[PDB]
Design a protein around this nucleic acid. Structure first.
Length: 48
RNA sequence: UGAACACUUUAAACGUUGGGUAAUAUUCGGAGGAUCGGUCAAAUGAGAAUAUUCCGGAUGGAAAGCCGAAGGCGAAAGCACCAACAUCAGAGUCACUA
């Protein structure tokens, strides 16, 4: 039971956290970079 | 997926308020003196007091005649005078939400 838990559960869960967090860092690099410069240029040109 | 924002685009979507109309029968005076109505066809009547009509006037509300279409909007029934109030809705782009 301890072999199953510490040698499966925490590392398979760890795979799930780091995979969705690499995905979240992908989505967050998107929403910072392309979104932020696009919308500040749009708001800049719309107020001009 | 579902929903709110910023743009692009949509009309017979929805209720209220003001105004209009080809057209409608009734009526006030005038033209005109026996036809009109109507149907496969025939039959009460309008009419010898003036009928269809025609002139021009009033009335008052129906319905929106063409547009307009195997076109649109709608959840469906449905929705076809504008103008404005007005509350939406639906589609596309670009972003939020996880």
């Amino acid at each position: 039971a301890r072999m199953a838990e510490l040698l499966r559960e925490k590392r398979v869960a760890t795979l799930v956290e780091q995979v969705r967090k690499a995905e979240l860092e992908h989505k967050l690099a998107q929403v910072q970079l392309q979104r932020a410069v696009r919308r500040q240029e749009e708001l800049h040109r719309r107020e001009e």
